[PDB]
Amino acid sequence: KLKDLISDSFDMASLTNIFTCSNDLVHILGVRTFNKLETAVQLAVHLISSYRQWFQNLDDKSLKDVITLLIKRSLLYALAGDSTGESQRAFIQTINTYFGHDSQELSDYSTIVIANDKLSFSSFCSEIPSVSLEAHEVMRPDIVIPTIDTIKHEKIFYDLLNSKRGIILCGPPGSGKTMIMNNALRNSSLYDVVGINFSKDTTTEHILSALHRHTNYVTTSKGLTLLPKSDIKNLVLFCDE
């Protein structure tokens, strides 16, 4: 049922225009759409399967709506996830134009959250509380001011990480990329961070030693030797620069 809904949810006649418009866009670390397709499909399928038991009680219209919204978000963050904020917004407008208008419209910060005691869906935007600081807390190297963009980036970073594919965080210096990664992975207790600071000269032996610091070799009759880690909690080999 879910695979039929995914296949019937998006049709290539609509997506040709989306891909062509994606080509007409400035891309930092530019990669051809033929390669971004893997990220788009993987993220879309992971997002759709993350709620695969909460569609049974949902009517088919709303099921199609939620599938289309997830597809739109994955396409946005794969095709145009490496562009400027304004370019992304233009791409939400493009996606909403080219997809059918009978589906839920992706917004700048559209998200899906749900309670099992009271079934909830549809787009939720600007639900971050505002906090005021004391006078003596103006500048310390420990104070973060959460905004809509920071929450959005943490959410999409976590969603990409849960899809089992690598993430490259491109940004100007002092944009808090490691800050976003730390706040995204410290809230959950399923990923372990092993940071590596790349230098001008770096050998594979550094990566191997860092992995061996946290990971334990195993030997099996099938699969020969494998390299798990110590615990069930997953690993993240964050390699900066």
Coordinates of C-alpha atoms in Angstrom, one line a residue:
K1 CA 0.0 0.0 0.0
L2 CA 2.7 2.5 1.0
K3 CA 4.8 1.8 -2.1
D4 CA 1.8 2.2 -4.4
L5 CA 1.0 5.5 -2.7
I6 CA 4.6 6.7 -3.2
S7 CA 4.7 5.6 -6.8
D8 CA 1.3 7.3 -7.6
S9 CA 2.1 10.3 -5.5
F10 CA 4.6 11.9 -7.8
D11 CA 4.7 11.6 -11.6
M12 CA 7.7 12.5 -13.7
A13 CA 5.6 14.8 -15.9
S14 CA 5.5 17.2 -13.0
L15 CA 9.1 16.5 -11.8
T16 CA 10.8 17.3 -15.2
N17 CA 10.0 21.0 -14.7
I18 CA 11.2 20.8 -11.1
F19 CA 14.5 19.2 -12.1
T20 CA 15.0 21.7 -14.9
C21 CA 14.4 24.6 -12.5
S22 CA 16.8 23.0 -10.1
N23 CA 19.4 23.2 -12.9
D24 CA 18.6 27.0 -13.2
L25 CA 19.9 27.6 -9.6
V26 CA 23.2 28.6 -8.0
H27 CA 24.6 25.6 -6.2
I28 CA 27.6 25.7 -3.8
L29 CA 29.6 22.5 -4.3
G30 CA 27.6 22.0 -7.4
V31 CA 26.5 18.5 -8.1
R32 CA 24.4 17.4 -11.1
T33 CA 20.7 16.5 -10.4
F34 CA 21.4 13.0 -11.6
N35 CA 23.4 12.6 -8.4
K36 CA 21.1 14.5 -6.0
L37 CA 18.3 12.0 -7.0
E38 CA 19.7 9.4 -4.6
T39 CA 19.5 11.8 -1.7
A40 CA 16.0 12.9 -2.7
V41 CA 14.6 9.3 -3.0
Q42 CA 16.4 8.0 0.1
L43 CA 15.2 10.9 2.3
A44 CA 11.7 10.8 1.0
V45 CA 11.4 7.1 1.6
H46 CA 12.9 7.3 5.1
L47 CA 10.5 10.2 6.1
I48 CA 7.5 8.3 4.7
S49 CA 8.5 5.0 6.5
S50 CA 9.1 6.8 9.8
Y51 CA 5.3 7.0 10.3
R52 CA 4.3 3.8 8.4
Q53 CA 1.9 2.6 11.2
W54 CA 0.1 6.0 11.6
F55 CA -1.5 6.0 8.1
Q56 CA -3.8 3.1 8.7
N57 CA -6.3 5.3 10.7
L58 CA -5.9 8.2 8.3
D59 CA -8.2 8.7 5.3
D60 CA -6.7 8.3 1.8
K61 CA -7.0 12.0 1.0
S62 CA -4.9 13.0 4.0
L63 CA -2.5 10.1 3.4
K64 CA -1.9 11.4 -0.1
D65 CA -1.5 14.9 1.3
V66 CA 1.1 13.9 3.9
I67 CA 3.0 11.8 1.3
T68 CA 3.1 14.7 -1.1
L69 CA 4.3 17.1 1.6
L70 CA 7.1 14.7 2.6
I71 CA 8.1 14.3 -1.0
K72 CA 8.1 18.0 -1.5
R73 CA 10.3 18.6 1.6
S74 CA 12.8 15.8 0.5
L75 CA 13.0 17.2 -3.0
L76 CA 13.6 20.7 -1.7
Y77 CA 16.4 19.7 0.7
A78 CA 18.1 17.4 -1.9
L79 CA 17.8 19.5 -5.1
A80 CA 18.2 22.9 -3.5
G81 CA 19.5 22.1 0.0
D82 CA 23.0 23.4 -1.0
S83 CA 21.8 26.8 -2.1
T84 CA 21.2 30.1 -0.3
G85 CA 18.2 30.8 1.9
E86 CA 16.5 33.0 -0.8
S87 CA 17.2 30.4 -3.5
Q88 CA 15.6 27.8 -1.3
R89 CA 12.5 29.9 -0.8
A90 CA 12.2 30.4 -4.6
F91 CA 12.5 26.6 -4.9
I92 CA 9.6 26.1 -2.4
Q93 CA 7.6 28.4 -4.6
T94 CA 8.7 26.4 -7.7
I95 CA 7.8 23.1 -6.1
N96 CA 4.4 24.3 -5.0
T97 CA 3.7 25.7 -8.5
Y98 CA 4.7 22.5 -10.4
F99 CA 3.0 20.0 -8.1
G100 CA -0.7 19.8 -8.0
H101 CA -2.5 22.4 -5.9
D102 CA -4.9 19.8 -4.4
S103 CA -2.0 18.7 -2.1
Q104 CA -0.8 20.4 1.1
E105 CA 1.5 23.3 0.3
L106 CA 5.0 23.1 1.5
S107 CA 6.0 26.3 3.3
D108 CA 9.3 27.8 4.4
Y109 CA 9.1 26.0 7.8
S110 CA 6.4 23.5 7.3
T111 CA 6.7 20.5 9.6
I112 CA 4.7 17.5 10.8
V113 CA 4.4 16.6 14.5
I114 CA 1.8 14.2 15.9
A115 CA 0.3 13.0 19.2
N116 CA -1.0 9.4 19.5
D117 CA -3.6 10.5 22.1
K118 CA -5.0 13.1 19.6
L119 CA -4.1 12.5 16.0
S120 CA -2.6 15.7 14.5
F121 CA -1.2 16.6 11.1
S122 CA -0.8 19.5 8.7
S123 CA 1.9 22.2 8.6
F124 CA 3.1 23.8 11.8
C125 CA 5.3 26.9 11.6
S126 CA 6.9 29.3 14.2
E127 CA 6.4 27.3 17.4
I128 CA 9.7 28.3 19.0
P129 CA 9.4 30.2 22.3
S130 CA 11.4 33.5 22.6
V131 CA 13.8 33.8 25.5
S132 CA 15.4 36.9 27.0
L133 CA 18.8 36.9 28.7
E134 CA 20.3 38.7 31.7
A135 CA 22.6 41.7 31.3
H136 CA 25.7 39.7 32.4
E137 CA 25.1 36.9 29.9
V138 CA 25.6 39.1 26.8
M139 CA 28.7 37.3 25.5
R140 CA 30.1 34.0 26.6
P141 CA 31.3 31.1 24.5
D142 CA 28.4 29.0 25.7
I143 CA 25.3 31.0 24.8
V144 CA 23.1 30.0 21.9
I145 CA 20.0 31.9 20.6
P146 CA 17.7 29.3 19.0
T147 CA 15.8 30.7 15.9
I148 CA 13.6 29.2 13.3
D149 CA 16.5 28.6 10.9
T150 CA 18.6 26.8 13.6
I151 CA 15.7 24.5 14.6
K152 CA 15.0 23.8 10.9
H153 CA 18.6 23.0 10.2
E154 CA 18.8 20.7 13.2
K155 CA 15.6 18.9 12.2
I156 CA 16.8 18.3 8.6
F157 CA 20.3 17.3 9.7
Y158 CA 18.7 14.7 12.0
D159 CA 16.4 13.5 9.3
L160 CA 19.3 13.1 6.8
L161 CA 21.3 11.3 9.4
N162 CA 18.5 8.8 10.1
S163 CA 18.4 8.1 6.4
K164 CA 21.8 6.3 6.6
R165 CA 23.7 8.6 4.2
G166 CA 26.6 11.0 4.6
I167 CA 26.1 14.7 5.1
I168 CA 28.4 17.5 4.0
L169 CA 27.8 20.7 5.9
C170 CA 29.0 23.6 3.8
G171 CA 29.0 27.1 5.3
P172 CA 31.1 30.2 5.8
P173 CA 33.4 30.2 8.9
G174 CA 31.8 30.7 12.2
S175 CA 28.3 29.7 11.1
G176 CA 27.9 27.2 13.9
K177 CA 27.9 24.0 11.8
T178 CA 29.5 22.0 14.6
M179 CA 27.1 23.9 17.0
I180 CA 24.1 22.7 15.0
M181 CA 25.5 19.1 14.9
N182 CA 26.2 19.1 18.6
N183 CA 22.7 20.4 19.5
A184 CA 21.1 18.0 17.1
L185 CA 22.9 14.9 18.4
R186 CA 23.1 15.7 22.1
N187 CA 19.3 15.8 22.5
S188 CA 19.0 12.2 21.2
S189 CA 20.7 9.2 22.9
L190 CA 21.3 7.1 19.7
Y191 CA 24.3 8.7 18.0
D192 CA 27.9 9.1 19.3
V193 CA 30.0 11.9 17.9
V194 CA 33.7 11.4 17.1
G195 CA 35.1 14.7 15.9
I196 CA 38.2 14.8 13.6
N197 CA 39.9 18.1 12.8
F198 CA 41.4 17.8 9.4
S199 CA 44.7 19.5 8.7
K200 CA 46.6 20.5 5.6
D201 CA 48.2 17.1 5.7
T202 CA 46.1 14.3 7.0
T203 CA 46.5 10.5 6.4
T204 CA 44.0 7.7 6.6
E205 CA 45.8 6.4 9.7
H206 CA 44.4 9.3 11.7
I207 CA 40.8 8.3 10.8
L208 CA 41.6 4.6 11.4
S209 CA 43.0 5.4 14.9
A210 CA 40.1 7.6 15.8
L211 CA 37.7 4.9 14.7
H212 CA 39.6 2.2 16.7
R213 CA 39.4 4.4 19.8
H214 CA 35.6 4.0 19.8
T215 CA 35.0 0.9 17.7
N216 CA 35.7 -2.8 18.3
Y217 CA 36.6 -5.3 15.6
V218 CA 34.6 -8.5 15.4
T219 CA 35.2 -11.7 13.4
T220 CA 32.4 -13.7 11.8
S221 CA 32.4 -16.8 9.7
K222 CA 30.1 -15.0 7.2
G223 CA 31.2 -11.5 6.2
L224 CA 34.8 -12.1 7.3
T225 CA 35.9 -9.4 9.7
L226 CA 33.5 -6.5 10.5
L227 CA 33.9 -3.3 12.5
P228 CA 31.0 -2.6 14.9
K229 CA 31.5 -0.2 17.8
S230 CA 31.3 -0.7 21.5
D231 CA 27.7 0.1 22.1
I232 CA 24.3 0.0 20.3
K233 CA 24.2 3.8 20.2
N234 CA 25.3 4.7 16.7
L235 CA 28.4 6.6 15.7
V236 CA 28.9 9.8 13.8
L237 CA 32.4 10.5 12.4
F238 CA 32.2 14.2 12.1
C239 CA 35.2 15.3 10.0
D240 CA 35.6 19.1 10.0
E241 CA 37.4 21.0 7.2

